[PDB]
Amino acid sequence: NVWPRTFQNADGSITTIPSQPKRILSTAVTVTGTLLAIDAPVIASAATTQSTFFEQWRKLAELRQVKKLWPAGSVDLESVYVEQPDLIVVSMIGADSARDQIPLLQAIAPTILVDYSDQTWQSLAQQLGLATGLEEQAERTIHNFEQWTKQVRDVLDLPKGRANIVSYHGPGVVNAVAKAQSAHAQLLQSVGVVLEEPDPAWQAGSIVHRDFLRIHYEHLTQLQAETTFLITMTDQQAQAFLHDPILKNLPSIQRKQVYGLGENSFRIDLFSAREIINSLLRRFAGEQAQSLVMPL
């Protein structure tokens, strides 16, 4: 395990990490879940704009004494200095991105930049494993999860056809649909779901996103999949989608195959991925469900 080592950042820049990181500070709440997943020594993390940690890993973060820092958008440099980190992690795109603050952060400690929007949680874990010297941990974690998804894939009786994954906000608002490279789409694909891709031409406005295509509301009526999964929703919450009169003729609504992906499914990390797969076992597997549900 060689140190120093060079890390390739998502913007084409490089960062030399002089020594194995032991005090990692995350500036992106999305990335923190994956740092926890590989048991990296993350000692502090910024939060959502609402000053929260994601619920799938909050209790674990508290147990490991991960200090909650600023809500996304407002980097507190004093807090970074006081934590005395030896690696600072930044995301490329998303509400939790501190990309423009990199020069200020790099003055404090080696700062790296990753894009979680177009890779699986496993790929992000591998990338972070290489930055932290935790390749053994990451590889083991990924391998174990993949052994599990194999087993699950073999017992699910999924609806015929394909599924889409939607972030729903109702009429008169820009909504969003998961793209093939998203952590969400790839997670479902891994247990045998066949994914519908939103038409790239439906992009709303000028901002490019690799995770979910942002679209005018009306385009939701054009989705063809027989099944719809809603992020950040329970099944009960998904009822609002099902009863939206504008969407009454959607194949997934006609077949009453609209499901919540789960309360904690907004971002995908090992912890929310487990919850999501557990939900699929409960709904689509028989008395084979329980033999495979993972303890949280």
Ligand X SMILES: C[C@H]1OC(c2cccc(O)c2O)=N[C@@H]1C(=O)NCCCN(CCCNC(=O)c1cccc(O)c1O)C(=O)[C@H]1N=C(c2cccc(O)c2O)O[C@@H]1C
State the residues that interact with ligand X by CB under 6 A. 29-30, 48-49, 72, 93-96, 167, 169, 176, 209, 211-212, 266
> What, of Fe ion, ligand X, none, does residue 262 touch, CB below 5 to 8 Å by kind?
none
DSSP string, 10-23: TTS-EEEE-S--SS
- Closest-approach residue to Fe ion (CB): 95
Query: Letter for the amino acid at 112?
Result: I
Query: Per the structure block, which two tokens stand in for 288?
Result: 């084979």
- The nearest distance, CB 62 to Fe ion, in angstroms, is 24
- The nearest distance, CB 212 to Fe ion, in angstroms, is 9
Binding residues vs Fe ion (CB under 5 A): 95
Backbone angles phi, psi at 100, to 5 degrees: -75, -15
- The nearest distance, CB 32 to Fe ion, in angstroms, is 15
Nearer to ligand X, 171 or 286 (CB): 171
DSSP run (H or E) holding 43: strand 42-47
Nearer to Fe ion, 14 or 95 (CB): 95
Of 271, 239, 117, the C-alpha closest to 184 is: 117
Query: Letter for the amino acid at 165?
Result: I
> What, of ligand X, Fe ion, none, does residue 169 touch, CB below 5 to 8 Å by kind?
ligand X
For residues 267 and 54, the answer to whether their CB atoms sit within 8 Å is yes
- The nearest distance, CB 19 to ligand X, in angstroms, is 30
- Count other C-beta atoms under 10 Å from residue 118's C-beta: 19
Nearer to ligand X, 112 or 134 (CB): 112
